Amino acid sequence: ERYENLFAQLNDRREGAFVPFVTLGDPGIEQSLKIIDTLIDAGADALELGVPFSDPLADGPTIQNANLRAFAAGVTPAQCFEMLALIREKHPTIPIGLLMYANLVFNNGIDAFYARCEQVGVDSVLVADVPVEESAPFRQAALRHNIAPIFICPPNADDDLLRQVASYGRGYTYLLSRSGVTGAENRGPLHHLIEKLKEYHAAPALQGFGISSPEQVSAAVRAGAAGAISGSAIVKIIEKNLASPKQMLAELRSFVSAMKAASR
């Protein structure tokens, strides 16, 4: 119950969660493991980790290039799970969530995918291209292996959607702050959804999409959200420093520390 304890701990501290995102193996297996440890060391409360996919159709240019860079290093899904096993052996308590595209979980059988997640220590799985209308098999397999099935609550969500997300989801509710794809390029009033999700005893909301400044995470928390996820702002730093790994890490720490502080 990694997310459960994390949120209870953060609540007692009257604090929000800061959850950075990166593509596993970007720009290399080793630099990525190093990037991930720096992320945690600078104050990350949890992690959202994507495994490289050929067609990331819910991602903008930054994350697209994150998958391309990973692909260029030859990072395969098998390698990702090996990386995840090690990250867990290194960090016992931090919630580990995976950003997944559908073919990758269905490829070797949906059930076998969630069993691998368990074996490795993954805490949750968000399948980016499976709406709640199609979640049944994924949801069921996740629960069967003690994996929290993450659902996306969009800004155009109706009440039936809110009620579905709140009953099926575990770990955290992914609250979109915008329409469109991932990108720190376009900046995202979510109070109503936040209150309604609370009413239905949904999983603590985590705002995602567009979150690039500490100001943004303080506002998410102020609006009632349990925390915020930031990906492109994070990955942009990796892109910015491909020729200087040491500066990458140094810059990664600076942003994450400034971002974590904004939730306190």
């Binding site: 067609d55 159709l57 991602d59 559908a102 490829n107 291209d129 209308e133 469109g180």
Partner: protein
């Protein structure tokens, strides 16, 4: 949803949550339009007086000489634009309009779907945005200029393999934040529901016309109807009206490229693996890791990395049979139709003709009433075959 998103095990609605309301809207506007006589009369008018409907059914006499086979050809090559794709887009453009939408987004590979989307949008006052993998933009210059000349915005997609796959991605990305004012004009009978159902229903004319036509010309339904399958549109459009006629065989022909055995092909329904991509559960050109792969064929238009869900379903229950045809086989059918019938067939269609020629040549004494869907014109392919 109002209709079943699946055909057996295949289909579904695998798109990010943000796009679900758009698919529900689209589905409902389709069901309404389908029952709307004003829409039907408007679509019928565009089809007849602007596109050239109905198309001819040509008895190829010379080609079948010395055999007991009778071969007709659905002349979709005579439609405005040179391909069956024109039927689909007109209806979808009217659908976009019914919805209050005035913006169109379109994915294209060989450039045939883009040209079609572009002409439909020009005609109906819609703003057209078209995505094309950079490698296809460099490869398909004449179609790009045609598109641009018809008012459409052409946008090169450099991500991934910079081809169809990637163009499709970009279109859904765009749509995920523009659905409120723009409609996504998908190019084939694949993708997320309601699309496979809509493209089919909007391609039905083909088989509906072939029925009355053959019934008039031969007083009998065909023994089989053959059509190429890149994505599945022209084939299902032909098949559709014959599905309940159990005596008529349905034959889908997938591109074999250099040979199945070489791995250099575009035959996912038969030599691919079921996966989930492009808002769909269906057979796919995939790696062992489930990374999406490319479809190869001498014909650019038969390079959609997957196939329609209904086809994968018709194959599953045995209603329809799917075979493949190599580059050389298509080259030969192409050559033969030019020489004996005076018709230059698209290299896409040539795969379908190639199979009919096989059926004939292999069993020359067998009495057979065959209809091949000549989905498009081959003026496009003159240079390619030449080299």
């Amino acid at each position: 949803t109002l209709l079943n998103p699946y055909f057996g095990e295949f289909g579904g609605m695998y798109v990010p949550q943000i796009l679900m309301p758009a698919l529900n809207q689209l589905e409902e506007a389709f069901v309404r339009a389908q029952k709307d006589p004003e829409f039907q009369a408007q679509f019928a008018d565009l089809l007849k007086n602007y596109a050239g409907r109905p198309t001819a059914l040509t008895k190829c006499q010379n080609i079948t000489a010395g055999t007991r086979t009778t071969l007709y050809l659905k002349r979709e090559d005579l439609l405005h634009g040179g391909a069956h794709k024109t039927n689909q887009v007109l209806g979808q453009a009217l659908l976009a309009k019914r919805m209050g939408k005035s913006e169109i987004i379109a994915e294209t590979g060989a450039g045939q779907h883009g040209v079609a989307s572009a002409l439909a949008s020009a005609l109906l006052g819609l703003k057209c945005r078209i995505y094309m993998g950079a490698k296809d933009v460099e490869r398909q210059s004449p179609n790009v200029f045609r598109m641009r000349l018809m008012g459409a915005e052409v946008i090169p997609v450099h991500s991934g393999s910079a081809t169809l796959k990637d163009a499709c991605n970009e279109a859904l990305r765009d749509w995920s934040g523009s659905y409120e004012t723009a409609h996504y004009m998908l190019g084939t009978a694949a993708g997320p529901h309601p699309y496979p159902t809509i493209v089919r229903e909007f391609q039905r004319m083909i088989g509906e016309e072939t029925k009355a036509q053959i019934l008039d010309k031969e007083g009998r339904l065909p023994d089989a109807v053959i059509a190429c399958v890149g994505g599945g549109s022209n084939a299902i459009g032909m098949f559709a009206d014959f599905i309940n006629d159990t005596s008529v065989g349905l034959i889908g022909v997938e591109p074999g490229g250099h040979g199945i055995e070489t791995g250099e092909h575009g035959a996912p329904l038969k030599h691919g693996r079921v996966g989930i991509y492009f808002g769909m559960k269906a057979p796919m050109m995939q790696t062992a890791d489930g990374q999406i792969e490319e479809s190869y064929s001498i014909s650019a238009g038969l390079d959609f990395p997957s196939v329609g869900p209904q086809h994968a379903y018709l194959n599953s229950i045995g209603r329809a049979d799917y075979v493949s045809i190599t580059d050389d086989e298509a080259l030969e059918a192409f050559k033969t139709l030019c020489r004996h019938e005076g018709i230059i067939p698209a290299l896409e269609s040539s795969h379908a003709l190639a199979h009919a020629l096989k059926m004939m040549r292999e069993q020359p004494e067998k009495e057979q009433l065959l209809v091949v869907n000549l989905s498009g014109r081959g003026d496009k392919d003159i240079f390619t075959v030449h080299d």
